[PDB]
Amino acid sequence: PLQYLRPGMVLLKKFLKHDDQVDIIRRCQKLGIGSGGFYTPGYRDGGKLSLQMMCLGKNWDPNSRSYGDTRPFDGAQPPSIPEVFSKIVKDAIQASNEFLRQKARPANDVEELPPLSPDICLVNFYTSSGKLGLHQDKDETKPSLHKGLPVVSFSLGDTAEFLYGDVNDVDKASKVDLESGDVLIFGGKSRLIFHGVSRIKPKTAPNWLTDEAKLRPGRLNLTFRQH
Ligand SMILES: [Mn+2]
């Protein structure tokens, strides 16, 4: 149910509840079509295919590769992060730290992820041909990175094949499947892993979610960070 991938990297299988997944899709469907909604980025670190994005909270701008209050190309301010999203993020960290507490026993230090008060949510939508190349989440402020403040990532819809490793070379990357409802956290010594999405597995989204949320083919990711 909870899986240790490497120091400070925990995968919470099927962590998102039924109604929360539906609620997350429905909120992103509505925010995604309004002001500050989804657009196709001209640039992503690592390259990309069949990817649209929108930010909640602070905006990450592709053209400038920095954080700000509004999207430069249309002046839109991003919607704020729903408080229910922030609640789930904090629960995921709490659950991870309890897992790391129980797995500690005693040839090594006790692991513990730092808390997160995310003010950045990157919402990525991949259609079935989607991909995102290996990259580091390296645009947050130096104190945020130096403290190892974690990245918390929600997965919904079709399964992603997720690559991660220490370098920009797939030959040295590990693979894990991120299925609908999974939450992945990387912080501490894993905060700067290279990572990406090599493939979306078509027709893997749960039928109940496709039906209740009217989800289009593909995968929705929400990636939370603290600037
Ligand atoms: Mn990333």
Side-chain angles (χ1 to χ4, degrees), residues 1-47 49-65 67-139 141-224 226-227:
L2 270 86
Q3 287 163 27
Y4 180 90
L5 299 193
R6 37 181 285 165
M9 187 172 189
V10 172
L11 169 62
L12 300 88
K13 296 296 300 177
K14 299 305 171 161
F15 189 74
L16 299 177
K17 299 193 225 310
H18 173 123
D19 275 343
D20 292 336
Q21 288 190 58
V22 177
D23 184 44
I24 288 159
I25 299 292
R26 283 183 179 152
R27 288 173 182 262
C28 287
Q29 285 172 331
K30 191 169 170 63
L31 299 190
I33 49 187
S35 184
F38 282 100
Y39 68 102
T40 303
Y43 159 67
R44 292 291 301 258
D45 193 3
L49 245 180
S50 298
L51 170 71
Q52 302 167 257
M53 62 178 284
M54 69 161 292
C55 292
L56 317 172
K58 268 71 193 83
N59 184 65
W60 184 88
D61 172 38
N63 186 68
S64 88
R65 324 192 266 290
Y67 285 104
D69 302 343
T70 70
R71 291 121 65 100
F73 66 93
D74 64 2
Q77 178 173 337
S80 60
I81 302 178
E83 205 153 23
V84 65
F85 290 7
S86 292
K87 171 234 163 173
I88 297 173
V89 164
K90 283 166 202 294
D91 287 349
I93 295 171
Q94 275 195 336
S96 294
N97 279 345
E98 177 67 19
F99 169 69
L100 295 166
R101 269 187 287 276
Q102 288 182 30
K103 294 295 128 195
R105 295 291 63 201
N108 321 288
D109 297 354
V110 179
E111 283 186 42
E112 197 173 23
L113 287 154
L116 200 68
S117 299
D119 50 13
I120 299 148
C121 179
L122 216 175
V123 187
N124 295 293
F125 181 66
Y126 304 79
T127 54
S128 319
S129 52
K131 291 190 186 184
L132 177 62
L134 294 180
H135 65 280
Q136 292 177 302
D137 285 0
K138 61 186 186 159
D139 295 337
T141 69
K142 279 189 68 172
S144 185
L145 297 182
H146 167 53
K147 290 184 173 63
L149 276 35
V151 178
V152 177
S153 163
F154 297 176
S155 290
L156 302 85
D158 289 330
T159 299
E161 296 182 27
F162 182 83
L163 274 36
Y164 58 100
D166 297 313
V167 295
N168 179 31
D169 188 341
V170 72
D171 287 339
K172 297 293 179 185
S174 300
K175 311 168 187 172
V176 64
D177 287 351
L178 301 177
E179 308 180 284
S180 195
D182 290 354
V183 172
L184 174 70
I185 303 185
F186 47 105
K189 292 188 212 323
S190 287
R191 178 52 179 81
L192 286 183
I193 54 168
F194 282 84
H195 58 279
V197 172
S198 56
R199 204 180 193 296
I200 307 297
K201 300 183 172 304
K203 314 278 288 174
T204 45
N207 180 245
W208 62 265
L209 181 59
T210 298
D211 275 6
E212 295 182 22
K214 299 311 171 202
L215 222 214
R216 60 190 293 197
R219 171 177 175 267
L220 186 65
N221 162 258
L222 292 80
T223 288
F224 299 85
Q226 185 165 353
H227 193 25

